Write an enzyme that holds these catalytic residues in place. Structure first.
Site, PDB file in Angstrom:
ATOM      1  N   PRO A   1       6.726  10.775  -4.371  1.00  0.00           N
ATOM      2  CG  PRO A   1       6.071  12.046  -6.247  1.00  0.00           C
ATOM      3  CD  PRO A   1       6.059  12.044  -4.723  1.00  0.00           C
TER       4      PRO A   1
ATOM      5  CE  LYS B   1      -3.047  -2.325   2.478  1.00  0.00           C
ATOM      6  NZ  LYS B   1      -1.663  -2.769   2.807  1.00  0.00           N
TER       7      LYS B   1
ATOM      8  N   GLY C   1     -19.484 -14.818  -3.704  1.00  0.00           N
ATOM      9  CA  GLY C   1     -20.230 -14.756  -4.950  1.00  0.00           C
ATOM     10  C   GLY C   1     -20.599 -13.353  -5.398  1.00  0.00           C
TER      11      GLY C   1
HETATM   12  O1  H2U Z   1      -8.961  -2.071   2.032  1.00  0.00           O
HETATM   13  C1  H2U Z   1      -8.254  -3.014   2.277  1.00  0.00           C
HETATM   14  C2  H2U Z   1      -6.979  -3.199   1.498  1.00  0.00           C
HETATM   15  C3  H2U Z   1      -6.018  -4.029   2.345  1.00  0.00           C
HETATM   16  N1  H2U Z   1      -6.699  -5.200   2.891  1.00  0.00           N
HETATM   17  C4  H2U Z   1      -5.875  -6.380   3.203  1.00  0.00           C
HETATM   18  O2  H2U Z   1      -6.524  -7.526   2.682  1.00  0.00           O
HETATM   19  C5  H2U Z   1      -6.355  -8.643   3.596  1.00  0.00           C
HETATM   20  C6  H2U Z   1      -7.716  -9.107   4.058  1.00  0.00           C
HETATM   21  O3  H2U Z   1      -7.622 -10.086   5.088  1.00  0.00           O
HETATM   22  P1  H2U Z   1      -8.932 -10.710   5.739  1.00  0.00           P
HETATM   23  O4  H2U Z   1      -9.586 -11.642   4.719  1.00  0.00           O
HETATM   24  O5  H2U Z   1      -8.486 -11.570   6.921  1.00  0.00           O
HETATM   25  O6  H2U Z   1      -9.900  -9.549   5.999  1.00  0.00           O
HETATM   26  C7  H2U Z   1      -5.420  -8.148   4.696  1.00  0.00           C
HETATM   27  O7  H2U Z   1      -4.066  -8.392   4.313  1.00  0.00           O
HETATM   28  C8  H2U Z   1      -5.680  -6.646   4.694  1.00  0.00           C
HETATM   29  O8  H2U Z   1      -4.629  -5.869   5.230  1.00  0.00           O
HETATM   30  C9  H2U Z   1      -7.990  -5.119   3.271  1.00  0.00           C
HETATM   31  O9  H2U Z   1      -8.480  -6.039   3.905  1.00  0.00           O
HETATM   32  N2  H2U Z   1      -8.751  -4.053   2.975  1.00  0.00           N
END
Ligand code: H2U
Ligand code: H2U
Ligand code: CL
Lengths: 219, 220
Positions: free
Chosen positions: A71, A66, A184
């Protein structure tokens, strides 16, 4: 043409132990060929864990880092991440066009991919992100971004994202299972779903991942 | 300042060199002038999280991990815990993801006896697109959450001034963007308690002289 996610299911490996992470990933390898690796694992085990995942599983690696800096710093981060062997990196769009473009340049320079995170799945995302989500998605389009990340927790928001980015853009979506998203209904707009805790915290991660797929084969 | 953890000479080094030897060498050359080092992902992703503890032991400096934490609450907690486990004294957290995300970081910091810095407004041009319009609200959200440490843009003195008056005189404010990004040390230090400086120092031919020169212009 961006990524062929087996069974449209991506594993969010956020276990912070190498032995735990490698084991659970091994138990769902027959169902999952694409693994999303984030800071919890990497900061606990080192960037080398990416190469060890590729060697032990032959799977595709999305680095959910993330990226959200200026930049110049964004470039250094992307460069280190790709060097470590990540196929793609997830990048925040809220820092603006120049920060995203910085990542896009490095991805092109190294022949790898950038995913643009437009809207987040958690409740706090409503405060600032949700109101900017559309314009961030549009910004991505103007920048030529082909890969996006959207909230499974909001099917209506996820649908708007799809009509913005177009039908040939690639879209993946976290927040399925633990956060409340339905597999789904998420796959109606997204190409693949990201599932973390619903797999790696289950008694049987294999059965969990298989149970998710067996309720998806109709789609 | 003794009411908060202050910084020597109001100067924080942004050590964003990406190899251990250069990072260790440059930091050592300027150690006499600073006691707080900001370590970010460029160094950590290249050399591992162990580099945080190494710097802390070698230089006796406070470590701020500029990780700009910006995930959901659950993941934020895992990131903060791992960062503090690595020995960092503070961690920088994005505010844009919302209150629940910042609160998750605050919980771990308070539990382990460490600090959270709330990044409210960024210093790059792109910050004007979405962050600037939300920065005032992110700042007062921080105040309400109990956040006492903040990061604001040196490239925009008027925005930094607005930030200071939102968080009040008791809050601690540090500011990047000085030097390479075009920010001036003098105008910035009218509002911030300390400046973050990276390339101006670590890419200089003589980093020590660069650090000394900046402190001098601050000194008066
Ligand atoms: O908006 C976001 C982007 C990052 N993520 C990332 O996705 C993953 C989701 O994990 P879970 O299925 O246990 O919620 C986890 O690594 C989390 O940091 C989100 O869940 N939501
Ligand atoms: O808004 C921000 C927060 C992060 N930072 C961080 O501060 C550091 C700035 O150092 P430079 O003096 O080399 O610009 C660098 O590590 C960068 O990632 C910003 O510059 N602006
Ligand atoms: Cl000197």
């Amino acid at each position: 043409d961006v990524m062929d996610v087996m069974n449209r299911l991506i594993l969010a490996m956020d276990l912070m132990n190498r032995d735990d992470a490698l084991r659970v990933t091994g138990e769902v390898r027959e169902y999952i060929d694409t693994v999303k690796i984030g800071y919890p694992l990497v900061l606990s085990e080192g960037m080398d864990i990416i190469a060890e995942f590729r060697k032990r599983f032959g799977c595709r690696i999305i680095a959910d880092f993330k990226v959200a800096d200026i930049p110049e710093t964004n470039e250094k981060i992307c460069r280190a991440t790709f060097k470590a062997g990540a196929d793609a990196i997830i990048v925040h769009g809220f820092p603006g066009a120049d920060s995203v473009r910085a990542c896009l340049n490095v991805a092109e320079e190294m022949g790898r991919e950038v995913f643009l995170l437009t809207e987040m799945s958690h409740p706090g995302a409503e405060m600032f992100i949700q109101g900017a989500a559309d314009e961030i998605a549009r910004m991505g389009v103007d920048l030529g971004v082909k890969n996006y990340v959207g909230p499974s927790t909001r099917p209506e928001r996820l649908s708007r994202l799809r009509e913005i980015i177009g039908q040939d853009s690639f879209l993946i979506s976290p927040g399925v299972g633990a956060q409340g998203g339905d597999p789904g209904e998420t796959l109606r707009f997204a190409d693949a779903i990201i599932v973390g805790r619903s797999i790696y915290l289950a008694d049987n991660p294999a059965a969990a991942a298989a149970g998710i797929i067996e309720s998806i084969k109709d789609l």
